[PDB]
Amino acid sequence: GLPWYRVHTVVINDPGRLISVHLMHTALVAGWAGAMTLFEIAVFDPSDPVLNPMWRQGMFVLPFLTRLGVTQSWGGWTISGETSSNPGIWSYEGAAASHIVLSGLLFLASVWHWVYWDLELFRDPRTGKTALDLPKIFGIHLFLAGLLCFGFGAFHVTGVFGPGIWVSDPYGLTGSVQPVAPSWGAEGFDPYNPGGVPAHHIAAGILGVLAGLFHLCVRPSIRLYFGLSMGSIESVLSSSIAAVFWAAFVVAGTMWYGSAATPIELFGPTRYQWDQGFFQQEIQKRVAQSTSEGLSVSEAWAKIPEKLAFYDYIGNNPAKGGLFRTGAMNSGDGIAVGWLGHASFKDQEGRELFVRRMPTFFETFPVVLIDKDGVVRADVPFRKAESKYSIEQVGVSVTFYGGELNGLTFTDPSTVKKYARKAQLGEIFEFDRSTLQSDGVFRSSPRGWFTFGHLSFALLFFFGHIWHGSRTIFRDVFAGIDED
Amino acid sequence: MARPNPNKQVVELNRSSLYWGLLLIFVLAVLFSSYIFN
Amino acid sequence: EVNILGLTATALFIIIPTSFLLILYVKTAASE
């Protein structure tokens, strides 16, 4: 018999059944893609593209669909808020249905390859035994991969035949799917440069085609063949798993740190964008540039877009949720319905105070309001018995200069403490916590969930590569030595 | 009557019965899912 | 959205009898 952890070793010396189980896995993955897309379309709310975007709704595969071109659906809406033209067959639901049909076709092909496994194509012509010419298979597959990479980089992303890819504002305000001109200079190796992706895919496709032709034409040496066990499918399994977890580590790193292939408007903002004051610095620079040209600071803030203030909010921080805080980001702290405005605080005598923002590490943070120089001038105290900074005696009043609260000056210290506690989280926003019966605690972004899942998968596949490399290098002692 | 059970029997289900059972289950689901989802 | 009660009921009513019938057919075809 076979142990439960060895039941798939029956298709090692069986190329037809190995192709059958590959087709089974491929069908399952494509069916998952279609079903996940349809679930996200069913639970997606496209009403508010600016203030309730897809990454606030827990959308996982919709950012990846959008990134390569599909934007409108069969429901007549578009994620950009624009008027939908003809979606053609390639909408969100159209791509999902194509994935489901492909999954069914792969299921049928898997059944056929399971039944018909003794094909002469898998038989060696001179020995009669079953064998696979793995260097030639690798050459053919590398040629196909190079052709696909070159086509995707020369026709799809450059827009000469395809739609292009998603490019946006550096602050994530305005963005859309459009063609991208390749960058062949050193700027093409700039990770945030969108032009480096077509230049990559063209150059890597050309190199892959050349290397596939080389592997088609040239056989390996005997020493290298025996060193890497090229006659063994277990060795190529180990090497493929190695390359795959390398790529998983790379995609997790690019997702976490942000790149041109990881748009903010699709995957949410970055924890380093929150820590480094990216949106906060841009907002303050816009306000300063407006007020330096003779503009009152109640309408210089009104020029600030709703989307940028939403980006400058710790509740949108990907490194803020929990492992078991499951679901959408809206289900954590409500659906955002409006920007209350920029809370500006003053003392009794009159000087501007600033609430110290919560860092990423902190689940909780004391509420302090410090001066421009950097001295603590007020806070929400804990002891309230020997308080020498409490708002009730300091006299901190909040003014507000935004959407719903534009000139409502609150001198009530009970409300001032609450507005300071809301101000340490970034820009104060109004939320609806009754539509989804929201929790209160912050949830994680699809960016954070992607990074966590893929880093865990990358460590697991490092172990898998080590195990399979052990099994293929030590094949004889894993089989037996026979008293020698 | 002894250590093993004399009443030991096995269950037999051929492909026609498998097809009939699968068809009955799926047709019942088709008929009743519209009412379960409501 | 999503009627998760109807989804669970439909999925269970599909999975449990189909798996039961498939297991019976497999054990019948294994031992002729």
């Binding site: 069913a42 | 026609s16 097809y19 068809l23 799926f26 689901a29 088709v30 989802f37 | 999503v2």
Partner: peptide
């Protein structure tokens, strides 16, 4: 989902009747 479940059930029934037509057990005794 709503329409997806209906489509899945309908194509499952169609696949069952297709398998019953083509991949049936061959008839024996008359």
């Amino acid at each position: 989902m709503e329409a997806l479940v209906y489509t899945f059930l309908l194509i499952g029934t169609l696949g069952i009747i297709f398998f019953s037509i083509f991949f049936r057990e061959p008839p024996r005794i008359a």
